[PDB]
């Protein structure tokens, strides 16, 4: 079934964003492990896997709609310290959140209700899992201090 | 069996207090989870369930005595920081403790020995479980500092 | 993430409604048990638990959106006989249904698609589980008579 | 193997009748569930499945005989109350019974002894299971009254 | 709860379409088995069951909304060869897809958000399961030839 | 119990036919194995066993009726290539089908209803299992070509 | 431990190559699934996972050596038909093979014997698993023809 060209193009925009999110969590998780914060490694490794699944869902939807997936990831922007890495991931998730919400509205406009539902599922993950957890970590650093927070992530 | 009107009225006073205690622990537990203190979430979630059971016991006793339960909870007074929330819960439990003790004396006066026993069981829970745990948390904050205490509740 | 103030306010309106629904099912279920209708006790006890979960989902969403939950339940309006209690619960569920549908439209307007999805899930429960079951009970009373219906609920 | 054209045509007549019987039990069973008579839902849901199997056996026999199955169901005639629905199903089963008996005689005449045996199996189901159960329900309504009967089917 | 008449009418249009889809897959699956293509029999038999479930969901929703289900299936249009049968099923699924998308928009317009969600679930099945699989089979025939494809379906 | 001489004689005619069918499937199945078509070996080996059981049922019925079984098999007519062997078996099964149908009519005429039932069971096997499968194989060869069909039977 | 800058730079070159290989197998595997070649999907999905592990090993080695990983994948070059996709993957693996062999020699020169061993393990995978399998598939197409080969990959 040929999808609407505007929807396919927009799904491709989201795909390159999620390929990038995957890769930013790839490098951050391994940096956290390099420093000995295995709890941070585990969480972000899980997030890398979740973004790979999100990318996969978009890629397969684009194919179903007879489009050609764009596989070049967006640029990533890793941090150099734990607070910078948390903030960088939160900025990325906030961007993905806004992009997904714009996509949902576009899908509704072009009456692509299945694509809308795929994006809604990803939007729920972004808001309620990914971004929320990051906000929590930054809030913990604010409440107990960075040194105590880092200790908790060994 | 028709209970004594003064006893039924007093049980209703306790019921609206325990419905409120339930709801204060509902909001506090979820606030603790929002901030990432899952140990505090778990404890206060348990306390919400225990207050629901306490309320249930009163409600069912009032019905047995042919009274009409009052289901409007008392006002609650949540805190805005972990120390404020602990103190607010401790103030509430201290109020419930005093109210329950007054109720036990009233039940004895009107020779409602089963109602007295229900209240005694709740009084033991209030003193030895709920209020004691809160006093302990505040004491821990005093002994190790707030930042270390918060770290321990992740 | 700061949610839209109109959405947060509306979620709070729904929250106080579901806290009330919880408490109306609390008193009705225990009244049904007081009279010996254990099948009615079991169903409405289950419904109390489901409304607590619905309230919980709203409360947690409001927190995520950086709002402050309103924990005062709406007034409840219990019945005094089995037919009155069924009708009172059905009136409440019909009100909740309309409120949820209005909320879904508001969330769509403000592009809060995750809040919309939470409300849609609750709307499906309200229509297809809660209200439908109540309509069925009233229909059974109409078809077999109240005395036979009550017998069936022992 | 090419079957006798008169036999194939007659099997097709039976097929469209059993496709209809399937669909009448589909709507009646779901109507019974809509009203809260889950015992009636379960029985007629089972009967829908049995008529689908009966239709399947005819369809496959028609194909084996190199015929072309007729897939348009006969018109159905659902009732609007429990007694009307029972009577409507009994009228349908009585029609199917007569049609099957006529088919058995035709198959014997054209020496299609396997088709005869398929129809005999369906005839036994119609008489001893489907129609008999319906006759029993109507007899129960006659003996205990409709209200008691409906109570028994919750 | 009385549903909107335009929504109920439209659900009935979808119901008669899915009853037809059920029956087209009924005849095609058994034709595939008649020829010895058991893999095609199994898939389309599964699809018949899925369309029966889709029809069931619509029928039950129409009843809940106090409507009267229309049980006459639309006409079906079976093929006479494997490529014709695949194409006929794909044409049917493309029609169902468009009808479901129009229904979702109508439900949104009349603020029947639960009916919309039921249709969205069916739309996802139609696009991502039913039609996609058919497109794949036709593509396989194009890539390996019909004779090799048929061999693979024994 | 002495059976009717015409029935016993006719059962003996069927017996020598089924002893022959057994032996034709014996040689064909082993020829298929000799060439490396193990799927054809397995099917026809199964068919040899089924014809032995059919012969056994006739033999035992003839004895019960105080007749003397005729144990000389009819001549067999094996093919020399896979298509010839399939056709030869189909010709044999078509002959057995006609003979069994004539026998059923004779048994009915002489009121030997148990012998009729034994023959009906064998007739169903012949039509719905043996001959049908052969027709399917020849149809597969027609649809995918002989070389692909042979490949599928390795 | 600070690694040799020439070795770290070269590991980064290999990393961006393996991130690209991962993504080329991501798109090819999902294209194969889109067309219904599930055996090809499974193999290339496995290869995507293996390249992710290869990339991970390089990334972690670069971190250990106090380098900064380069996370931008090389450009990929997907095919548009099964033979083109196989050839494109084989060209990529041949490039990776040569790059890894050059890296091993460089590591030996700079006496980084652990980095050499990591690359040797990847070189064995590339030659004996990835490239070999691709060569085999192309050889199969040459020996049995493309249509038969595609049939085998359903
Ligand atoms: Na994502
Ligand atoms: Na994310
Ligand atoms: Na510490
Ligand atoms: Na208490
Ligand atoms: Na307490
Ligand atoms: Na609710
Ligand atoms: Na409800
Ligand atoms: Na009764
Ligand atoms: Na039937
Ligand atoms: Na029947
Ligand atoms: Na459907
Ligand atoms: Na479908
Ligand atoms: Na036989
Ligand atoms: Na035979
Ligand atoms: Na082949
Ligand atoms: Na590699
Ligand atoms: Na490789």
Curated annotation (Swiss-Prot), chains A, B, C, D, E, F, G:
Fe(3+) A binds at residues 18, 51, 54. One of its GO terms (molecular function) is iron ion sequestering activity. Binds up to 5 iron ions per subunit depending on the protein state; aside from Fe(3+)A and in some structures Fe(3+)B, the other sites are approximately half-occupied. The unstable catalytic dinuclear iron-binding site within each subunit (probably Fe(3+)A and Fe(3+)B) is known as the ferroxidase center; it is labile. This is Bacterial ferritin. Fe(3+) E binds at residues 50, 129. The bacterioferritin (BFR) complex is formed of 24 subunits (FtnA and BfrB) arranged as 12 homodimers. The holocomplex contains about 8.7% Fe and 8.0% phosphate. In vivo purifies with BfrB in varying ratios, depending on the O(2) content; as O(2) decreases FtnA content rises. Pure FtnA BFR complexes are not isolated in situ, although in a bfrB deletion some iron will accumulate in FtnA ferritin complexes. Fe(3+) C binds at residues 46, 50. Gene3D superfamilies: 1.20.1260.10. Fe(3+) D binds at residues 47, 50, 129. Its EC number is 1.16.3.1. Disruption phenotype: Produces about half the wild-type levels of catalase A in strain PAO1 (katA), slight increase in sensitivity to H(2)O(2), a double katA-ftnA deletion is more sensitive to H(2)O(2). When grown in iron-limiting conditions is less sensitive to H(2)O(2). BFR complexes are composed only of BfrB. The record marks 130 as: Dual function in ferroxidase center and iron gate. Pfam families: Ferritin. It comes from Pseudomonas aeruginosa (strain ATCC 15692 / DSM 22644 / CIP 104116 / JCM 14847 / LMG 12228 / 1C / PRS 101 / PAO1). GO terms for cellular component: cytosol. SUPFAM superfamilies: Ferritin-like. Residues 1-145 form the Ferritin-like diiron domain. Plays a role in catalase A (katA) expression; activity is required for optimal KatA activity and resistance to H(2)O(2). Iron-storage protein that is part of the heterooligomeric bacterioferritin (BFR) complex. The ferroxidase center binds Fe(2+), oxidizes it using dioxygen to Fe(3+), and participates in subsequent Fe(3+) oxide mineral core formation within the central cavity of the BFR protein shell. Can store up to 520 iron atoms per ferritin protein molecule. Iron release requires only the input of electrons from ferredoxin NADP reductase (FPR), does not require Bfd. Does not bind heme. Induction: Transcription is up-regulated by FeCl(3) and H(2)O(2). It catalyses: 4 Fe(2+) + O2 + 4 H(+) = 4 Fe(3+) + 2 H2O; Fe(2+)(in) = Fe(2+)(out). Keywords: Cytoplasm, Ion transport, Iron, Iron storage, Iron transport, Metal-binding, Oxidoreductase, Transport. It is found in: Cytoplasm. It comes from the Bacteria. Fe(3+) B binds at residues 51, 93, 130.
């Amino acid at each position: 079934m040929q999808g609407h060209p505007e929807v396919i193009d927009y799904l491709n925009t989201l795909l390159t964003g999620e390929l990038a999110a995957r890769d930013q969590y790839f490098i951050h998780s391994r940096m956290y492990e390099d420093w000995g914060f295995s709890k941070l490694y585990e969480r972000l490794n899980h997030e890398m896997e979740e973004e790979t699944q999100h990318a996969d869902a978009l890629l397969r939807r684009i194919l179903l709609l007879e489009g050609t997936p764009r596989m070049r990831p967006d640029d990533i922007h890793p941090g150099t310290t734990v607070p910078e890495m948390l903030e960088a991931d939160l900025k990325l998730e906030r961007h993905v959140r806004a992009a997904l919400a714009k996509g949902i509205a576009l899908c509704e406009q072009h009456k692509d209700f299945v694509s809308r539902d795929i994006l809604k599922a990803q939007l729920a993950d972004t808001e309620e899992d990914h971004a929320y957890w990051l906000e929590q970590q930054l809030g913990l650093i604010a409440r107990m201090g960075l040194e105590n927070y880092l200790q908790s992530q060994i």
